[PDB]
Amino acid sequence: APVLPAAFGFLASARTGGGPVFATRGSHTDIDTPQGERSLAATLVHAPSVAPDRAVARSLTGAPTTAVLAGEIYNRDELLSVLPAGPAPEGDAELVLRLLERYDLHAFRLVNGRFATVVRTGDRVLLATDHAGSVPLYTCVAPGEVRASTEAKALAAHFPLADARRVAGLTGVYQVPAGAVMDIDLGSGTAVTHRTWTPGLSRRILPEGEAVAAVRAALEKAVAQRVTPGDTPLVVLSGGIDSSGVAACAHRAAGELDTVSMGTDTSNEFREARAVVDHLRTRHREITIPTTELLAQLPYAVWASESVDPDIIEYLLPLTALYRALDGPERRILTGYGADIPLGGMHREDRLPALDTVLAHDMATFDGLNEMSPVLSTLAGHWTTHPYWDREVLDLLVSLEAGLKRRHGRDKWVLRAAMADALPAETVNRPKSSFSRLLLDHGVAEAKRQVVRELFDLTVGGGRHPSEVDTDDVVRSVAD
C-alpha cells in the first residue's frame, strides 16, 4: 500500500483565554491538550489509513513545546546526520523539533521537503513553509491569539501582518510566504518573518557532460526520496519530456510503476504516453473526460486551490478532474509539473536573453499561485509531490546558464539529454478554450475573474461545498 504523509493539513490555534471544514478529504483527529488552553490545540486532517502520531511532536526543551506538521521531509538522512545522541525521531514533526533545539528557527534553512508546520514553544509561535511553499499555510494573528491552517477557508469561517500577503477575497487572513518562517510573540501578537530560501540569481557554467550528469543524478535522487521503499507509485503521464523523465526515475527507484493519462473530447496525449508505457512496461490507464464535465470542475478547482486567478484555475481544471476520476485506493502520485519554469520550457526563439528574463520573473512571482498545493489531489484522498520543484533539483535547474536550456535548437535540452539513455528517442526529442468558449456562448468576446471570484466567495469565503454550486447559474448571473 502507498505510504502517505502522517497528515495532509491542519487547523491549529494558540491562546491564553477562550467545526473545521476542509477541502482535503480524510479523517480528523484532535490532538491532546495537556496544559489546557495554554497548550497548542489543533485538528489534523489525514488519510484514514495513517496514524496522525508522526505528525505531532512534543518536548520540554526550552519550555513546553508542541509541533504539528503537514506533509513530509525528503532530505531525512542529511538532517539526522547533524543531530547529536543517537535515538532518532519517530516522525518528521519530531525531526523538526530536534532541529529547532539545535538551530532554532534556522532549522528551516536546512529542510528540503513538502510541508507546512506550526510550533508552539512557551508563548512563542513559529509558522513555517517549505522552500517553495508547495503546501499552503495561512494565519490570523492578534494579541494573545494565533490561528494557523493549511486552508484559508478554515480561517474565513471565524492586526495586519507585514511581510505576508493578504488572501484575496478574504479579510484578516494572511498567507505565510514561501520559504519562510514567521516568529510570533503570542502576547503582543507581533510577528517577524525570516526567509529560509530564495531563488538563485546567478548562473553556473558547466560542460555538457557534467551538466547532463548532474541533472540526471539530481532528478533520480529527488524522485527516490519521494517513492516508498517497496510500494509502486503512480505517475501522471503526459506526452512530454517532463512527466516521462519522472516516470523513468520512479520506475528505477521502485522497480515497477503505475501510470495514468487524462484526455478530453478535444485532445489527449495517449499515443505519446504509450511510447513510454511500453518502453518501461508500466500498468497504464487512460481517462477521457468530456469538456462539459471538465468545466464542472470550476467550483472544485477554486475550492481546492483557494485562488481567484482565472489563469491558474483554468490550468488546474484538468488536474482536479483527473484526481477525482482516479479509481481504486488512495495513492502516492508523482508529477512532472514545473519543469518549464526553471528550464524556460515556454521559450521558443533561439535568442537566450528572453529566456533568462522570463525565468527570473517567474521565479520571483510563483509564490501565492498555489499551483502545487496538495489539496488539488487530497480532495480525492490522493497525495501528490513534484520532483522538479525539489529544493536541490530546483536550485540546479535554475542555476544553469541559458545555453544549457536552449541548445542544439531544442528546449529544455539538458533535461532531454539527461534522460536520453532511459527513454525512447521519440519521447526525448518530442517538442511542445473550453472555458472561454462557455462564456463566449453567453457574452461579448471583449471577465472570467468575476466568475471565479463568485465561486471563491461561495466555496472559500462563504462555506458552500462545490457540489452545491451550479456552475451554469453562476456564469448566468455573470452575463453583462
CSV table of C-alpha atoms in Angstrom, one decimal:
chain,number,residue,atom,x,y,z
A,1,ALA,CA,0.0,0.0,0.0
A,2,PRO,CA,1.2,3.6,-0.8
A,3,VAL,CA,2.6,5.2,2.3
A,4,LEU,CA,1.1,8.7,2.8
A,5,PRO,CA,2.2,11.6,5.0
A,6,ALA,CA,1.2,11.5,8.6
A,7,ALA,CA,-1.1,14.5,8.0
A,8,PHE,CA,-2.3,16.4,4.9
A,9,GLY,CA,-3.3,19.5,6.7
A,10,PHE,CA,-4.5,21.1,9.9
A,11,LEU,CA,-6.2,23.9,11.8
A,12,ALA,CA,-4.3,25.0,14.9
A,13,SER,CA,-4.6,27.7,17.5
A,14,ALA,CA,-2.6,29.1,20.4
A,15,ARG,CA,-4.4,31.2,23.0
A,16,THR,CA,-4.3,32.3,26.7
A,17,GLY,CA,-8.0,32.8,27.1
A,18,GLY,CA,-11.1,31.3,25.5
A,19,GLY,CA,-16.2,22.7,13.4
A,20,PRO,CA,-13.1,22.6,11.0
A,21,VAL,CA,-14.2,22.1,7.4
A,22,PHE,CA,-11.5,21.2,4.8
A,23,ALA,CA,-11.4,20.6,1.0
A,24,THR,CA,-8.9,17.9,1.8
A,25,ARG,CA,-10.6,14.5,2.1
A,26,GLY,CA,-9.8,12.2,5.1
A,27,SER,CA,-10.1,11.6,8.8
A,28,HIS,CA,-9.9,14.2,11.5
A,29,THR,CA,-8.0,13.8,14.8
A,30,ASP,CA,-7.8,16.4,17.5
A,31,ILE,CA,-4.5,16.3,19.4
A,32,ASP,CA,-4.4,16.2,23.2
A,33,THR,CA,-4.0,19.5,25.2
A,34,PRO,CA,-2.0,18.5,28.3
A,35,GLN,CA,-1.8,22.0,29.8
A,36,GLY,CA,-5.3,23.1,28.8
A,37,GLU,CA,-5.8,26.4,27.0
A,38,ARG,CA,-2.1,27.0,27.3
A,39,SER,CA,-1.3,24.1,25.0
A,40,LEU,CA,-1.3,24.2,21.2
A,41,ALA,CA,-4.8,23.0,20.2
A,42,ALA,CA,-5.2,21.5,16.7
A,43,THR,CA,-7.3,19.4,14.4
A,44,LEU,CA,-5.4,17.3,11.9
A,45,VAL,CA,-6.8,16.1,8.6
A,46,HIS,CA,-5.2,12.9,7.3
A,47,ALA,CA,-5.7,9.6,5.4
A,48,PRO,CA,-7.9,7.0,7.2
A,49,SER,CA,-5.1,4.6,6.6
A,50,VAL,CA,-2.4,6.6,8.5
A,51,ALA,CA,-1.9,7.3,12.2
A,52,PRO,CA,-1.6,11.1,13.0
A,53,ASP,CA,1.1,10.3,15.6
A,54,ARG,CA,4.1,11.1,13.4
A,55,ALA,CA,2.7,14.5,12.5
A,56,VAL,CA,2.7,15.7,16.1
A,57,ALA,CA,5.7,16.0,18.5
A,58,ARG,CA,6.1,17.4,22.0
A,59,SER,CA,9.0,18.3,24.2
A,60,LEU,CA,10.0,20.4,27.2
A,61,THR,CA,13.3,21.7,25.8
A,62,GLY,CA,13.3,25.4,26.4
A,63,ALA,CA,9.7,25.4,27.6
A,64,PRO,CA,6.6,23.3,27.0
A,65,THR,CA,6.6,22.7,23.2
A,66,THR,CA,4.2,21.2,20.7
A,67,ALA,CA,4.8,20.8,16.9
A,68,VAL,CA,2.3,19.9,14.2
A,69,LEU,CA,3.5,19.1,10.6
A,70,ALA,CA,1.5,18.6,7.4
A,71,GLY,CA,3.3,16.8,4.6
A,72,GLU,CA,6.8,15.3,4.6
A,73,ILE,CA,10.6,15.8,4.6
A,74,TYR,CA,12.8,14.4,1.9
A,75,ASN,CA,16.4,15.0,3.0
A,76,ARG,CA,15.9,13.0,6.2
A,77,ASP,CA,19.3,11.3,6.2
A,78,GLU,CA,21.1,14.6,5.8
A,79,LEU,CA,19.1,16.1,8.7
A,80,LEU,CA,19.7,13.1,11.0
A,81,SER,CA,23.4,13.5,10.4
A,82,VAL,CA,23.6,16.9,12.1
A,83,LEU,CA,21.8,15.8,15.3
A,84,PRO,CA,23.6,14.6,18.5
A,85,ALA,CA,23.0,11.5,20.6
A,86,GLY,CA,21.5,8.5,18.7
A,87,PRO,CA,17.8,7.9,19.3
A,88,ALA,CA,16.3,9.2,16.0
A,89,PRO,CA,12.9,10.9,15.8
A,90,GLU,CA,9.8,8.8,15.3
A,91,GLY,CA,8.5,11.1,12.5
A,92,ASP,CA,9.1,14.4,10.7
A,93,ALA,CA,7.4,16.5,13.4
A,94,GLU,CA,9.9,15.2,15.9
A,95,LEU,CA,12.7,15.7,13.5
A,96,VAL,CA,11.8,19.4,13.2
A,97,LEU,CA,11.6,19.7,17.0
A,98,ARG,CA,15.1,18.1,17.3
A,99,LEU,CA,16.4,20.6,14.6
A,100,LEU,CA,14.8,23.5,16.4
A,101,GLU,CA,16.5,22.6,19.6
A,102,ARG,CA,19.9,22.9,17.8
A,103,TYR,CA,19.4,25.7,15.2
A,104,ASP,CA,16.2,27.4,16.5
A,105,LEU,CA,14.3,28.9,13.6
A,106,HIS,CA,17.4,28.5,11.3
A,107,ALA,CA,16.4,24.8,11.3
A,108,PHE,CA,14.1,25.6,8.4
A,109,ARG,CA,17.0,26.8,6.2
A,110,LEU,CA,18.2,23.2,6.2
A,111,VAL,CA,15.0,21.4,5.3
A,112,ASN,CA,14.3,20.0,1.8
A,113,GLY,CA,10.6,18.9,1.8
A,114,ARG,CA,6.9,19.4,1.0
A,115,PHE,CA,5.5,20.6,4.3
A,116,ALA,CA,3.7,23.3,6.4
A,117,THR,CA,4.2,23.3,10.2
A,118,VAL,CA,3.1,25.2,13.3
A,119,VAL,CA,5.1,25.1,16.5
A,120,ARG,CA,4.3,26.5,19.9
A,121,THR,CA,7.1,26.8,22.5
A,122,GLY,CA,6.1,28.7,25.6
A,123,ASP,CA,4.3,31.9,24.4
A,124,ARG,CA,6.2,31.8,21.1
A,125,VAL,CA,4.7,30.5,17.9
A,126,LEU,CA,6.5,29.6,14.7
A,127,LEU,CA,4.9,29.2,11.3
A,128,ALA,CA,7.0,27.6,8.5
A,129,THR,CA,6.6,26.6,4.9
A,130,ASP,CA,8.9,24.6,2.6
A,131,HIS,CA,11.3,26.4,0.3
A,132,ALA,CA,8.6,26.8,-2.4
A,133,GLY,CA,5.6,27.0,-0.1
A,134,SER,CA,4.3,23.9,-2.0
A,135,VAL,CA,2.0,23.3,0.9
A,136,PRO,CA,0.0,26.5,1.5
A,137,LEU,CA,-0.2,27.8,5.1
A,138,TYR,CA,-2.5,30.7,6.3
A,139,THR,CA,-2.8,32.5,9.6
A,140,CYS,CA,-4.8,35.0,11.7
A,141,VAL,CA,-2.8,37.0,14.2
A,142,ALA,CA,-3.9,39.1,17.1
A,143,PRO,CA,-2.7,39.9,20.6
A,144,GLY,CA,-2.9,36.7,22.6
A,145,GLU,CA,-4.3,34.7,19.7
A,146,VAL,CA,-2.8,32.9,16.8
A,147,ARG,CA,-4.7,30.6,14.4
A,148,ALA,CA,-3.0,28.8,11.5
A,149,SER,CA,-4.3,26.4,8.8
A,150,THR,CA,-3.4,24.7,5.6
A,151,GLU,CA,-6.6,26.0,4.1
A,152,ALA,CA,-7.8,29.7,4.2
A,153,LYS,CA,-11.4,28.5,4.2
A,154,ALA,CA,-10.9,27.1,7.7
A,155,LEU,CA,-9.9,30.6,8.9
A,156,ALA,CA,-12.6,32.5,7.0
A,157,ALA,CA,-15.5,30.9,8.9
A,158,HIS,CA,-14.1,32.5,12.1
A,159,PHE,CA,-3.7,43.5,13.2
A,160,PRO,CA,-2.2,43.4,9.7
A,161,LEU,CA,0.8,41.2,9.2
A,162,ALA,CA,3.8,42.8,7.5
A,163,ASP,CA,5.9,40.8,5.0
A,164,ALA,CA,2.9,38.5,4.5
A,165,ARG,CA,0.2,38.7,1.8
A,166,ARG,CA,-3.5,39.1,2.4
A,167,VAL,CA,-5.6,36.4,1.0
A,168,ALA,CA,-7.6,37.8,-2.0
A,169,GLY,CA,-11.3,37.6,-1.4
A,170,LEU,CA,-10.8,37.3,2.4
A,171,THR,CA,-10.2,39.8,5.2
A,172,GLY,CA,-7.9,39.3,8.3
A,173,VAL,CA,-6.4,36.2,6.8
A,174,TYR,CA,-2.8,36.1,5.7
A,175,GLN,CA,-0.8,33.5,3.7
A,176,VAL,CA,2.7,32.7,5.1
A,177,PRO,CA,5.3,33.4,2.4
A,178,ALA,CA,7.0,30.5,0.6
A,179,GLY,CA,10.4,29.5,2.0
A,180,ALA,CA,9.9,31.4,5.3
A,181,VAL,CA,9.4,31.2,9.0
A,182,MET,CA,7.2,33.6,10.9
A,183,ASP,CA,8.3,34.1,14.6
A,184,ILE,CA,5.3,35.3,16.5
A,185,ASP,CA,5.1,36.6,20.1
A,186,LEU,CA,1.7,35.4,21.3
A,187,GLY,CA,1.5,38.1,24.0
A,188,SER,CA,1.8,41.1,21.8
A,189,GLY,CA,0.7,39.5,18.6
A,190,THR,CA,3.7,40.8,16.8
A,191,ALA,CA,5.5,38.8,14.1
A,192,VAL,CA,8.9,38.7,12.4
A,193,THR,CA,9.4,36.9,9.2
A,194,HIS,CA,12.7,35.3,8.1
A,195,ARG,CA,13.2,33.9,4.6
A,196,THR,CA,14.8,30.5,4.6
A,197,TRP,CA,15.4,30.2,0.9
A,198,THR,CA,15.4,32.4,-2.2
A,199,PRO,CA,15.8,31.7,-5.9
A,200,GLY,CA,19.4,31.9,-7.1
A,201,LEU,CA,20.1,34.9,-9.3
A,202,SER,CA,23.5,33.9,-10.6
A,203,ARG,CA,24.1,31.4,-13.3
A,204,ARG,CA,26.5,28.5,-13.4
A,205,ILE,CA,28.7,27.3,-16.2
A,206,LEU,CA,29.4,23.6,-16.9
A,207,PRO,CA,30.5,21.5,-19.9
A,208,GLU,CA,27.6,19.5,-21.5
A,209,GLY,CA,28.8,16.2,-20.0
A,210,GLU,CA,29.0,17.4,-16.4
A,211,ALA,CA,25.7,19.3,-16.7
A,212,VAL,CA,23.8,16.4,-18.1
A,213,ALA,CA,25.1,14.0,-15.5
A,214,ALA,CA,24.3,16.5,-12.7
A,215,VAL,CA,20.7,16.9,-13.7
A,216,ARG,CA,20.2,13.2,-14.1
A,217,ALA,CA,21.7,12.5,-10.6
A,218,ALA,CA,19.6,15.2,-9.0
A,219,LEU,CA,16.3,14.1,-10.5
A,220,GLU,CA,17.0,10.4,-9.6
A,221,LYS,CA,17.6,11.4,-6.0
A,222,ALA,CA,14.6,13.7,-5.7
A,223,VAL,CA,12.4,11.0,-7.1
A,224,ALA,CA,13.9,8.3,-4.9
A,225,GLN,CA,13.3,10.5,-1.9
A,226,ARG,CA,9.6,10.7,-3.0
A,227,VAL,CA,9.0,7.0,-3.5
A,228,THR,CA,8.2,4.5,-0.7
A,229,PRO,CA,10.7,1.6,-0.5
A,230,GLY,CA,8.7,-1.4,-1.7
A,231,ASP,CA,5.5,0.3,-2.9
A,232,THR,CA,4.7,1.1,-6.5
A,233,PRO,CA,3.9,4.8,-7.1
A,234,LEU,CA,1.6,6.4,-9.7
A,235,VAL,CA,2.9,8.9,-12.2
A,236,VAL,CA,0.6,11.2,-14.2
A,237,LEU,CA,2.0,10.6,-17.7
A,238,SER,CA,1.8,13.2,-20.4
A,239,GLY,CA,3.4,13.3,-23.9
A,240,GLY,CA,6.4,15.4,-22.9
A,241,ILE,CA,9.8,15.0,-21.5
A,242,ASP,CA,8.7,16.4,-18.2
A,243,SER,CA,6.4,13.6,-16.9
A,244,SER,CA,8.3,11.0,-18.9
A,245,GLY,CA,11.5,12.0,-17.2
A,246,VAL,CA,9.9,11.5,-13.8
A,247,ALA,CA,8.4,8.1,-14.8
A,248,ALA,CA,11.8,6.8,-15.8
A,249,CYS,CA,13.3,7.7,-12.4
A,250,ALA,CA,10.4,6.4,-10.4
A,251,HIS,CA,10.4,3.1,-12.3
A,252,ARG,CA,14.1,2.7,-11.4
A,253,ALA,CA,13.7,3.6,-7.8
A,254,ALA,CA,10.6,1.4,-7.3
A,255,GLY,CA,11.4,-1.3,-9.8
A,256,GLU,CA,7.8,-1.1,-11.1
A,257,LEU,CA,5.4,1.8,-12.0
A,258,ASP,CA,1.7,2.6,-12.5
A,259,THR,CA,0.8,5.4,-14.9
A,260,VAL,CA,-2.3,7.3,-15.9
A,261,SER,CA,-3.1,9.8,-18.7
A,262,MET,CA,-6.1,12.1,-19.0
A,263,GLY,CA,-7.7,13.4,-22.2
A,264,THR,CA,-10.7,15.3,-23.3
A,265,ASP,CA,-13.0,15.1,-26.3
A,266,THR,CA,-10.9,17.9,-27.7
A,267,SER,CA,-7.4,16.3,-27.3
A,268,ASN,CA,-5.2,13.9,-25.4
A,269,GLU,CA,-1.6,12.7,-25.3
A,270,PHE,CA,-2.3,9.0,-25.2
A,271,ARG,CA,-0.1,8.0,-28.2
A,272,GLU,CA,2.9,9.9,-26.9
A,273,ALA,CA,2.4,8.4,-23.4
A,274,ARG,CA,2.0,4.9,-24.9
A,275,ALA,CA,5.6,5.0,-26.1
A,276,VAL,CA,6.8,5.4,-22.5
A,277,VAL,CA,4.2,3.0,-21.2
A,278,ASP,CA,5.7,0.2,-23.4
A,279,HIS,CA,9.3,1.3,-23.1
A,280,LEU,CA,9.1,0.9,-19.3
A,281,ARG,CA,6.3,-1.6,-19.4
A,282,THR,CA,4.1,0.1,-16.8
A,283,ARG,CA,0.5,-0.6,-15.7
A,284,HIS,CA,-1.3,2.2,-17.7
A,285,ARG,CA,-4.8,3.6,-17.7
A,286,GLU,CA,-6.4,6.2,-19.9
A,287,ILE,CA,-9.1,8.5,-18.7
A,288,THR,CA,-11.1,10.8,-21.1
A,289,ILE,CA,-13.3,13.5,-19.6
A,290,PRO,CA,-15.9,15.4,-21.6
A,291,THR,CA,-15.3,19.2,-22.0
A,292,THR,CA,-18.6,19.7,-20.2
A,293,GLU,CA,-17.6,17.7,-17.1
A,294,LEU,CA,-14.2,19.4,-17.3
A,295,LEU,CA,-15.9,22.9,-16.8
A,296,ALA,CA,-18.0,21.4,-14.0
A,297,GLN,CA,-14.7,21.3,-12.1
A,298,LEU,CA,-14.6,25.1,-11.8
A,299,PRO,CA,-16.1,25.2,-8.3
A,300,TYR,CA,-13.8,22.4,-7.1
A,301,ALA,CA,-10.7,23.9,-8.6
A,302,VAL,CA,-11.2,27.3,-6.8
A,303,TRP,CA,-12.3,25.5,-3.7
A,304,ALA,CA,-9.1,23.4,-3.5
A,305,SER,CA,-6.6,25.9,-4.8
A,306,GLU,CA,-8.3,28.8,-3.0
A,307,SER,CA,-7.2,31.0,-5.9
A,308,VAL,CA,-9.1,33.8,-7.6
A,309,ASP,CA,-6.7,33.8,-10.6
A,310,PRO,CA,-8.7,32.6,-13.7
A,311,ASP,CA,-5.4,31.6,-15.5
A,312,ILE,CA,-4.5,29.3,-12.6
A,313,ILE,CA,-7.9,27.9,-12.2
A,314,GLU,CA,-8.0,27.1,-16.0
A,315,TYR,CA,-4.7,25.3,-15.7
A,316,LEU,CA,-5.8,23.3,-12.7
A,317,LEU,CA,-9.2,22.2,-14.2
A,318,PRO,CA,-7.8,19.1,-16.0
A,319,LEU,CA,-5.7,18.1,-13.0
A,320,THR,CA,-8.6,18.3,-10.5
A,321,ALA,CA,-10.7,16.3,-12.9
A,322,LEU,CA,-8.1,13.5,-13.2
A,323,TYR,CA,-7.5,13.2,-9.5
A,324,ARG,CA,-11.2,12.9,-8.8
A,325,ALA,CA,-11.6,10.4,-11.7
A,326,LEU,CA,-9.0,8.1,-10.3
A,327,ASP,CA,-10.4,4.7,-9.3
A,328,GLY,CA,-9.0,2.4,-6.6
A,329,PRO,CA,-7.3,3.2,-3.2
A,330,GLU,CA,-5.6,6.4,-2.1
A,331,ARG,CA,-2.3,6.8,-3.9
A,332,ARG,CA,1.1,8.5,-3.7
A,333,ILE,CA,1.4,10.3,-7.1
A,334,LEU,CA,4.5,11.9,-8.7
A,335,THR,CA,4.1,14.5,-11.4
A,336,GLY,CA,6.3,16.3,-14.0
A,337,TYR,CA,4.9,19.7,-13.1
A,338,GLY,CA,7.0,22.9,-13.1
A,339,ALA,CA,9.9,21.8,-15.2
A,340,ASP,CA,9.2,24.6,-17.7
A,341,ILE,CA,9.7,27.4,-15.2
A,342,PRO,CA,13.4,26.8,-14.3
A,343,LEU,CA,14.2,25.4,-17.7
A,344,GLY,CA,12.4,28.1,-19.7
A,345,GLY,CA,10.3,25.5,-21.5
A,346,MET,CA,7.9,28.0,-22.8
A,347,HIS,CA,10.7,29.8,-24.6
A,348,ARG,CA,10.5,29.5,-28.4
A,349,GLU,CA,13.3,31.6,-30.0
A,350,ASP,CA,17.0,30.7,-30.0
A,351,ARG,CA,17.9,34.1,-28.5
A,352,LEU,CA,18.9,33.4,-24.9
A,353,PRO,CA,18.2,36.8,-23.3
A,354,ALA,CA,14.4,36.5,-23.3
A,355,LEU,CA,14.8,33.0,-21.7
A,356,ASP,CA,16.5,34.4,-18.6
A,357,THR,CA,14.3,37.4,-18.4
A,358,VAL,CA,11.2,35.2,-18.2
A,359,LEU,CA,12.9,32.7,-15.9
A,360,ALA,CA,14.0,35.4,-13.4
A,361,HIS,CA,10.5,36.9,-13.5
A,362,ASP,CA,8.7,33.5,-13.0
A,363,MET,CA,11.0,32.6,-10.1
A,364,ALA,CA,10.2,35.9,-8.3
A,365,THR,CA,6.4,35.6,-8.7
A,366,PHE,CA,5.5,31.9,-8.2
A,367,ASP,CA,4.5,32.4,-4.5
A,368,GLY,CA,0.8,32.7,-4.0
A,369,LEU,CA,-0.3,30.8,-7.1
A,370,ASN,CA,-0.6,27.6,-5.2
A,371,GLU,CA,-0.2,25.5,-8.3
A,372,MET,CA,1.5,22.7,-6.4
A,373,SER,CA,-1.0,22.6,-3.5
A,374,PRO,CA,-1.5,19.0,-2.2
A,375,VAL,CA,-5.2,19.9,-1.8
A,376,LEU,CA,-5.6,19.6,-5.6
A,377,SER,CA,-5.3,15.9,-5.2
A,378,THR,CA,-6.1,15.3,-1.5
A,379,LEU,CA,-9.6,16.5,-2.1
A,380,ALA,CA,-9.9,13.0,-3.6
A,381,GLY,CA,-7.6,11.3,-1.0
A,382,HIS,CA,-4.5,11.2,-3.2
A,383,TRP,CA,-1.1,12.6,-2.2
A,384,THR,CA,0.9,14.4,-4.9
A,385,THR,CA,4.6,15.5,-4.9
A,386,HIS,CA,6.6,17.2,-7.7
A,387,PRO,CA,10.3,16.3,-8.3
A,388,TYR,CA,11.2,19.2,-10.5
A,389,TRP,CA,10.5,21.6,-7.6
A,390,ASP,CA,12.5,19.6,-5.1
A,391,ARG,CA,14.9,22.2,-3.5
A,392,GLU,CA,18.1,20.6,-4.8
A,393,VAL,CA,16.7,19.9,-8.3
A,394,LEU,CA,15.2,23.4,-8.4
A,395,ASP,CA,18.4,25.2,-7.4
A,396,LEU,CA,20.4,23.2,-10.0
A,397,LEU,CA,18.0,23.8,-12.9
A,398,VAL,CA,17.6,27.5,-12.1
A,399,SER,CA,21.4,28.0,-11.9
A,400,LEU,CA,22.2,26.6,-15.3
A,401,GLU,CA,23.2,29.1,-17.9
A,402,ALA,CA,20.6,29.6,-20.6
A,403,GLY,CA,22.8,27.9,-23.2
A,404,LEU,CA,22.2,24.6,-21.5
A,405,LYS,CA,18.4,25.0,-21.6
A,406,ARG,CA,18.1,26.2,-25.2
A,407,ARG,CA,20.8,24.2,-27.0
A,408,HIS,CA,21.1,22.4,-30.4
A,409,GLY,CA,17.8,24.0,-31.3
A,410,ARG,CA,15.9,22.2,-28.6
A,411,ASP,CA,14.1,23.5,-25.5
A,412,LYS,CA,14.9,22.0,-22.0
A,413,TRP,CA,18.0,20.5,-23.6
A,414,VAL,CA,19.9,19.5,-20.5
A,415,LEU,CA,16.8,17.5,-19.3
A,416,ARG,CA,16.3,15.7,-22.6
A,417,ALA,CA,19.9,14.8,-22.7
A,418,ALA,CA,19.8,13.7,-19.1
A,419,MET,CA,17.1,11.1,-19.8
A,420,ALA,CA,18.3,10.1,-23.2
A,421,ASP,CA,19.5,6.7,-22.2
A,422,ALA,CA,16.3,5.9,-20.3
A,423,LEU,CA,13.6,6.8,-22.7
A,424,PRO,CA,12.7,6.2,-26.4
A,425,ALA,CA,14.2,8.7,-28.9
A,426,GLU,CA,10.8,10.0,-29.9
A,427,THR,CA,10.0,10.9,-26.3
A,428,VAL,CA,13.3,12.7,-25.8
A,429,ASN,CA,13.2,14.8,-28.9
A,430,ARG,CA,9.4,15.3,-28.9
A,431,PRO,CA,8.9,19.1,-28.8
A,432,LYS,CA,6.0,21.0,-27.3
A,433,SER,CA,-10.6,27.4,-25.0
A,434,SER,CA,-13.4,25.5,-23.4
A,435,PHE,CA,-14.0,28.0,-20.6
A,436,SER,CA,-13.6,31.0,-22.8
A,437,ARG,CA,-16.0,29.4,-25.2
A,438,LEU,CA,-18.5,28.7,-22.5
A,439,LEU,CA,-18.8,32.4,-21.8
A,440,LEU,CA,-18.4,33.1,-25.5
A,441,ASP,CA,-21.8,31.4,-25.8
A,442,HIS,CA,-23.2,34.0,-23.4
A,443,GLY,CA,-21.5,37.3,-23.5
A,444,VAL,CA,-19.3,39.6,-25.7
A,445,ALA,CA,-15.8,38.5,-26.7
A,446,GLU,CA,-14.4,41.7,-25.3
A,447,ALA,CA,-14.0,38.8,-17.4
A,448,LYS,CA,-13.7,35.3,-16.0
A,449,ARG,CA,-12.4,36.8,-12.8
A,450,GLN,CA,-15.9,37.7,-11.6
A,451,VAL,CA,-16.9,34.1,-12.4
A,452,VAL,CA,-14.1,32.6,-10.4
A,453,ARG,CA,-14.4,35.2,-7.6
A,454,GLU,CA,-18.0,34.4,-7.3
A,455,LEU,CA,-17.2,30.7,-6.8
A,456,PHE,CA,-14.5,31.6,-4.4
A,457,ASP,CA,-16.9,33.8,-2.4
A,458,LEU,CA,-19.3,30.8,-2.3
A,459,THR,CA,-16.8,28.0,-1.6
A,460,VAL,CA,-13.9,29.7,0.2
A,461,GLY,CA,-15.2,33.0,1.5
A,462,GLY,CA,-18.7,31.6,2.2
A,463,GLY,CA,-18.7,28.0,3.1
A,464,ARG,CA,-20.7,26.1,0.5
A,465,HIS,CA,-19.5,22.8,-1.0
A,466,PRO,CA,-18.7,22.9,-4.7
A,467,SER,CA,-21.4,20.2,-5.3
A,468,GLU,CA,-23.9,22.8,-4.1
A,469,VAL,CA,-22.7,25.4,-6.6
A,470,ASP,CA,-24.3,25.4,-10.0
A,471,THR,CA,-21.5,26.3,-12.4
A,472,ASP,CA,-24.1,27.3,-15.0
A,473,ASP,CA,-26.2,29.6,-12.9
A,474,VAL,CA,-23.0,31.4,-11.7
A,475,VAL,CA,-22.0,32.2,-15.3
A,476,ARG,CA,-25.6,33.1,-15.8
A,477,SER,CA,-25.5,35.9,-13.3
A,478,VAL,CA,-22.3,37.0,-15.0
A,479,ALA,CA,-24.0,38.0,-18.2
A,480,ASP,CA,-23.3,41.7,-18.6
